[PDB]
Symmetry: D2
């Protein structure tokens, strides 16, 4: 039993989905299109204009112009704040449309898209609306003969690329901080998930964003992706997605000495210590990995359990795994949707095979589910060791690896022995051991007796090969900023 | 008349010069040595142990181990501040020694190595010892169910590579900020100028630095340099030198998703507007380019002159160029010493040639000077245009191009039309013009009615191809930190 | 002639004006009422419920209980930020009603209350709405054995008392910062101008403020004001008004060791140096004193003019003083309305007399104007000396004193020679002088080539007897915060 | 028996001079007063006595040093250097300063050396580092203006400090004020002027230009009032009794002088049911007995969960009777005398008042030894919230121990006080520690510890325990005026 389609999403899917360049909704200069799918049913869900290299130079020129002259270059910070703020309101106004688009286009459940994704995107904008007037430089006291101050100047035209797992919320992670600073934007959504953002384009127009401040260019990584990465007149690039493609972007960026920001993958450890509150910790371990179908860079894909509790938690995770209600995002019953694509499904089925072939046991799941659509069963793997492919590599599906350990110093050593370092979970009732452990984990975010919490105000990012830089909080601003130290001789 | 050699610099130079690894003075593991020259006389100044890849490896291991355990991992921020402070005192103490080594090894005049270099380095250390206790994170008010806090953790083992133009002071730009955050160090000084730093090693030992906190690995870019940029166990990398080599570093760093900071070359404009205080602006224009033999990334290598004053400044720059007293850095009368090497003298005479062949006029200088040593005459070029190699590329010598202009909007445009953006100078008595112009120039440092000022407390660095990141100031600390977001569930 | 009453101000004025306690519009417990006047006609404007000691108690209990429990105490910073922003929207929707109310009740011209007062009140609440999410504390690295962190906790219930010269805007200076930290508020408007704020009360309720977060108690200083400064359960106090009463408030606050923030009077200098753009400076000097009929603690009430220009600026100010069009605030052609009260007209006419008695000359104005109304003619005094009453005391009317000077060193001395230090203006085209002079003036804000500019983002407050603390900008938050330093032993 | 350092003997062999305008001077009118050794009750030294006219010479010297000459023209680096040189000298003279503290204040030598001197050295080192990092803001409002703020030194500051940590308290005051570029008129307590007056040599030697610091010993109604009421002092800072604080703020009002106050307390130290009991017992005991209880943030109220009450009472009584009482300059002393006759009497009198309202003295409750201002460490039992000794700052080694049955009950009883200086929480639970910390109305909260202070971390009172914070970056704001500059560039 189904969620009735919102009239505005009907009217929107009923037509070719246009790109948004220089204030206008447009086709690709050359007329190419591509299809996005409903991953639950595998039908074409919409036909979308495809940005080629040439649509990207157009988007760069519009952003370059909006950055140098016209209202965006001349507004006070109070006016810019006010724009970002009205955007937040219109989005909030269209919350149901956007959540349906996310459910339909990404696959995730409607009600979680609404409660989590949409509300976070709104609040992110609202939080960044707030920074615009508060991005301060320094005055530095050095000597009587000089006034010394710094300016935090927006770097300019920003190229941003985002993946398909939290489409709209990620557009906001990118654009809220970049906009707060006065930059202009050329942003490409993922091929699997363009609809969320191109719908939101209506909302930027209604809010009154001047022409060119924001430019949305959907398409493929080798064409629209590359053309952004390689553009001579883009001042800075931010990317989230595969550790692999990150390497590429940094390499390409070398050429222009362009600042890079990278939010990449993870194999984040979720540590249940001997004195954890097991009630809570089991739920955390399960939510840790299963939330968004495991399609989450910071998923707790390695669940470490003290030996005392090992069997209890395996038994619980197994029971909860076989209980998940799989089905369509737009069906009210659904607890976990399908994976985003056929390719994504095949890759995680592959990993499960490698798991088996390496000698690990599947204690639940391990295979596809349902009649059509890209589903996989929640999977729990057991009898696992540290050097196994499934324990080392990011799978990006509802697949968890559970790992006994015997001492605190041991679990920190094994949690840290990864070139990933996005996130980590620690479950202990003890005040001393919670901080001591959090301190010693090499990870950008540590939750003590929780997991998977994000907020506009708290920075998020990787150590080691999980990333360069932070997004969210005050920290994300520095990425979009170029520091100028002015010395005024006054002797 | 010669500056008399210091007893301690004589003893140091009488022996093979050792590397500094894990608290110990040592030879290269394979016993290789290389020679470093006195650029005034072309003699061998010293023989120096040469670090190979395996030496770099021993430096990383010693750094990794001083980072994870032992006194440096365990001491309070106050004990760390004190070490850095005592270091600065010890340097102040051996100031004449270090100044002679800079005169001898690098070439610059003794007195200016004493008053500028040694003194700035001492001051940089003292400024940074002050940060150690004040490196602060946030507590973030989000919700009554969580304590949210960030930690600024040292990134770990830091690979650092510096050039030959301000050898000691440049070692402090790297080490001050890094050590202040708790980081550990493997640092390579330039093949041309290893002595300052290797002498200074005595002082880190004497100050009581724990073993392996700091490691000094003299040698070549293809060997020691590459081994640092490629090492898998180095967490972060910092480099200053050619935009050329910067690109290579950034590209290799991509493999490991390693954070990079780059301080690179410039073609910095020094702009003399109509209402300049002309007597002042003339000296700033001459000093802007001639200071340190023009071997200065932020040299005012393009002097822009409002047309009314163009002839006047040229004549002055010519008369001044021809009066500089060239000689050995250890002779008392010397105002400008030799260029650092035969290679550098060739690169610069070459640029001058290209200058002549593209139609520019050599108004003063234009050739080598004296019987021996790597000397080039201070050089003034007129009848230049924006598209000339000599006006577009970094020469890295005492060579200046003078350009007339007719309007402020014109000179703004022409100053900015460059891939570089390290520094700029503007001279004007007017309150509005000063800041308007400063705001409009794309440059990491803008001096209004001054030039070439640096201080520990003020960040320095390039826009565009002049770099990524900042050194000095609070800002430099961010380069050596990883931000950890901790969520403490208190529901 | 006349601007017609808005329907909603008509409805509001046909009725007894109710107070606002604990989310309810109420009468005084004892049912007392008082009158407020149109200063243009002397007519009764409205009758208003009069808060007594018992009404303050009821207000404080409601604020205390809204601080300790219920939605305001539970809600996230995001929700709290959102309430403050919806408030600002409503104030903007009612912009015309609020401006009429201000013109009618305080006396200033409608157009300026609308363009200045209301828009600045909107912008102040928009600005602080952004802060609630960014009131950050510190994590302080001291020793591995501890976690150190500080929380900025809201002080609690705060008592705020404001004057009559900018009634609504001044309510936002106090409440914007206080509410952003999560404090609750008991606020008393001036007896001359309660209307704005009590109309604004609808808007707090309609925006969804929880019961008791905000409580408005109109009345008199000996009853309602006194009950506020003396109340044992009010945690913190903030006042703006005469230096005299500030003294009283600070004294009284000593008995409870209560943080005080005071915003008081001035005798601010506006200084025209030899190389000023004389045209902009003349206008700047005239607006500086004449804006808001001189009822402005930071009015440029001593105009210092370099000798070469004295006569020119005296002529122009006399002519300008003679030309201002005096009229009711609700007549469309009026440039300056009347002073707020009979008492105020009397005090300033008295100052004028005194000025005359001490041997100063009245170059313009110096007497009442029109048939009815608390009007006073814009007034210019010449032949003044530094120890005269009129040049030392705050007059709070459209009365200015013009003094010649001969050197920069001289005018700095004379400007600073005052117990006041609220503000200062300097007019010069020279980049050195503008900064030199502004560095040496003892004033909380200094305008170089302008005057009377305020913005939510820039701090305002006085040196010496002009006050304690700052309002506006990030700085104002500190006044409403109590710093907690937490030590977590993790040994 | 610890022997006098030769430079300490030299210092005490002479009348003790004030320090004004870089000069060691006698009082203009020639008055002197005595300071005593509170272990032996003999005069320890005869000190020049500052009168109103001396404070007035000090303010002039200070005003002049702020407004012109080297202290007003130095780079922040030069100024930092002077502060660091001071810290070194203090460290060089650590044994001398420690002995003076032990002799003048009464505290044990080893503690004076290990705590007081090292803390004061650290404070100056810490603040020397700030002088270069006192930054203001550049504020992006509009393109027509450059907006920036300067954090300027407020000017000549007036500082008054108590006798319980004489040298460290001179640093909490001077460190942050000097870092901002202010100049100083400082009065040490009449009971303990010596450390400061010795340290004055080190300021001169470090190269402080004349009149940057000026030290004026004497009495609160003469030198003290002169400072608070002086027309040319820009700002005032005081630490001492809640009562003198009211007077200070009261007087300060007349000139709209910024006040910073650090005052008394009755701080709770709360042992919950899941504390580590061995650790919480030691902390409860140190928390009150450290520095003989003459410590505004002494945990003078120990709340114990009912389950553990009798256990901790037993241990506190045992440890209270174990402390070794004696002279500060004697090798084995763990706790010395109170600072004066008047203090010893105030405290015995609080003891009487507790007995007579019905509390039981489970240990101590009377003077100790033949001569000197000693009182036995004292533990109070059968106490209720209502009693004098439980509401009022006693300021001696006297603890009151109270049972509680619930976390809500103890939080409310801890908070039910006009004080809020500090608090301690003992519990092994991660949630409970931060919830409780969050709820206590107190400027610093220690979780599983007590009495920790460090130059980096703010210290200060809620409610009547003070206004403002000292230490940390926070302290700088008290010594600063914020100037907001607008530059029209339209
Ligand atoms: Na799709
Ligand atoms: Na990384
Ligand atoms: Na050399
Ligand atoms: Na750059
Ligand atoms: Na009225
Ligand atoms: Na004041
Ligand atoms: Na004494
Ligand atoms: Na207080």
């Amino acid at each position: 039993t189904n969620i009735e389609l919102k009239p505005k999403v009907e009217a929107f899917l009923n037509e070719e989905i246009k790109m948004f360049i220089n204030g206008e909704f447009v086709s690709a200069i050359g007329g190419k299109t591509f299809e996005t799918y409903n991953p639950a049913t595998e039908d074409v869900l919409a036909v979308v204009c495809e940005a080629q290299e040439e649509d990207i130079d157009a988007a760069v020129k519009a952003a370059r112009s909006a950055f140098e002259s016209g209202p965006w270059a001349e507004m006070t910070t109070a006016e810019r704040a006010h724009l970002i703020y009205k955007l937040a309101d219109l989005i909030e106004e269209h919350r149901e449309e956007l959540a349906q688009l996310e459910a339909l286009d990404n696959g995730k459940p409607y009600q979680v898209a609404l409660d989590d994704d949409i509300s976070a995107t709104v609040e992110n904008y609202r939080y960044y609306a707030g920074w615009t007037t508060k991005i301060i430089g320094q005055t530095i006291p050095i000597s009587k003969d000089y006034l010394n101050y710094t300016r935090h100047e927006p770097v300019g035209v920003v190229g941003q690329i985002i993946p398909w797992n939290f489409p709209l919320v990620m557009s906001s992670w990118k654009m809220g901080a970049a906009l707060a600073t006065g930059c202009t934007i050329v942003l490409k959504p993922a091929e699997q998930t363009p609809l969320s953002l191109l719908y939101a384009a209506k909302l930027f127009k209604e809010a009154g964003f001047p022409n060119g401040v924001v430019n949305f260019v959907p398409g493929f990584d080798p064409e629209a992706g590359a053309a952004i990465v390689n553009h001579h007149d883009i001042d800075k690039v931010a990317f989230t997605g595969s550790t692999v493609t990150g390497k590429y972007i940094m390499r390409q960026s070398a050429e222009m000495i362009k600042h890079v920001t990278l939010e990449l993958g993870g194999k984040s450890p979720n540590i249940i210590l001997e004195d954890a509150d097991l009630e809570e910790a089991i739920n955390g371990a399960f939510q840790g990995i299963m939330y968004n179908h495991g399609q989450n860079c910071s998923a707790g894909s390695r669940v470490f359990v003290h030996r005392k509790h090992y069997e209890t938690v395996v038994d619980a995770l197994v029971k909860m795994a076989n209980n998940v209600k799989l089905g369509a995002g737009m069906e009210k019953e659904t607890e976990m949707g399908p994976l985003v694509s056929k390719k994504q499904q095949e890759r995680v089925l592959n990993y499960i095979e490698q798991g088996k072939k390496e000698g690990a046991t599947v204690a639940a799941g391990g295979e596809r589910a349902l009649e059509k659509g890209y589903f996989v069963k929640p999977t729990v793997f057991t009898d696992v060791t540290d050097d196994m492919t499934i324990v080392k590599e990011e799978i990006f599906g509802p697949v968890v690896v559970v790992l006994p350990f015997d001492s605190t110093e041991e679990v920190i050593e094994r949690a840290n022995n990864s070139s990933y370092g996005l996130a980590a979970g620690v479950w202990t009732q003890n005040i001393k051991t919670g901080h001591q452990v959090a301190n010693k984990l090499k990870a950008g975010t540590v939750w003590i007796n929780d997991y998977n919490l994000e907020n506009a105000a708290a920075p998020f990012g990787g150590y080691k090969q999980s990333g360069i830089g932070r997004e969210l909080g005050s920290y994300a601003l520095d990425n979009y900023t170029e520091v100028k130290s002015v010395w005024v001789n006054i002797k």
